[PDB]
Amino acid sequence: QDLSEALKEATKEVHIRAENSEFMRNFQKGQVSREGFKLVMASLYHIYTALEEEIERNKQNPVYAPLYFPEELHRRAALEQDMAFWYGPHWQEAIPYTPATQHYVKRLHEVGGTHPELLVAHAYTRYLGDLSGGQVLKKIAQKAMALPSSGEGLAFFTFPSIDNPTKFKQLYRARMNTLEMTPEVKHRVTEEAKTAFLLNIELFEELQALLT
Numbered sequence: 164q165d166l167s168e169a170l171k172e173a174t175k176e177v178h179i180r181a182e183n184s185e186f187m188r189n190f191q192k193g194q195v196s197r198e199g200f201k202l203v204m205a206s207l208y209h210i211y212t213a214l215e216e217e218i219e220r221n222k223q224n225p226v227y228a229p230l231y232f233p234e235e236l237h238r239r240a241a242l243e244q245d246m247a248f249w250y251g252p253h254w255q256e257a258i259p260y261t262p263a264t265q266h267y268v269k270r271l272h273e274v275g276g277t278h279p280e281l282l283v284a285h286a287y288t289r290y291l292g293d294l295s296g297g298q299v300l301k302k303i304a305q306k307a308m309a310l311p312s313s314g315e316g317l318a319f320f321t322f323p324s325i326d327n328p329t330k331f332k333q334l335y336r337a338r339m340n341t342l343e344m345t346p347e348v349k350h351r352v353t354e355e356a357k358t359a360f361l362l363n364i365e366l367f368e369e370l371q372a373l374l375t
């Protein structure tokens with residue numbers, strides 16, 4: 164198969180499980196509070212920071228380089244605005260850094276530092292959902308918490324350098340399909356995408372526990 168198809172098939176079952184975690188079921192129903200939302204967003208701040216640091220480190224490596232779209236995709240600067248919005252001018256002192264977020268960040272550093280050929284698993288898992296279902300959660304969050312259409316507090320979910328999320332996803336898939344790909348790399352990429360989903364599920368189960 165093509166790498167973009169392999170990855171979609173490989174993660175379709177775990178996507179179903181992730182969508183139905185308690186935290187995400189509550190989110191989807193509009194039951195997301197400012198408390199829960201700040202927890203998850205601060206956690207994403209550390210995750211995208213590590214992911215994008217490792218993307219920087221490996222930007223010239225042919226095992227990742229074709230997916231190098233900082234201007235279009237990178238989320239850290241957006242996450243920093245959201246952090247100043249949600250936690251105030253001293254957000255760096257204030258934001259939580261949970262065990263599950265730490266675990267996800269540590270795997271991101273291992274992949275980026277020792278297994279860069281798997282980095283595409285982690286970019287795929289985060290960015291492509293951001294450009295899909297993340298747009299649906301954005302509308303739900305705005306309605307649940309009364310966030311203005313103008314976008315404050317939801318910069319993470321807004322891609323000002325992408326005209327069309329769907330056409331962009333399609334370009335990105337096509338580029339994923341030009342990575343030099345052996346059966347070895349392909350097997351391990353799809354397995355690493357399953358682990359990335361699990362890391363997100365464990366984050367959700369932890370935030371949920373923290374909230375109840």
Ligand code: HEM
Binds near residue numbers: 287299
């Ligand atoms: C309840 C929460 C979620 C909802 C409502 C949701 C919804 C969706 C939707 C509607 C799509 C587009 C599917 C299609 O048309 O084929 C999608 C794709 C995707 N989602 Fe989610 N999702 C959720 C949770 C997650 C989580 C936790 C992750 C990963 C951490 C994730 C990652 C992805 C990825 C990587 C894709 C792209 C699949 C592909 O096109 O290859 N989603 N999701």
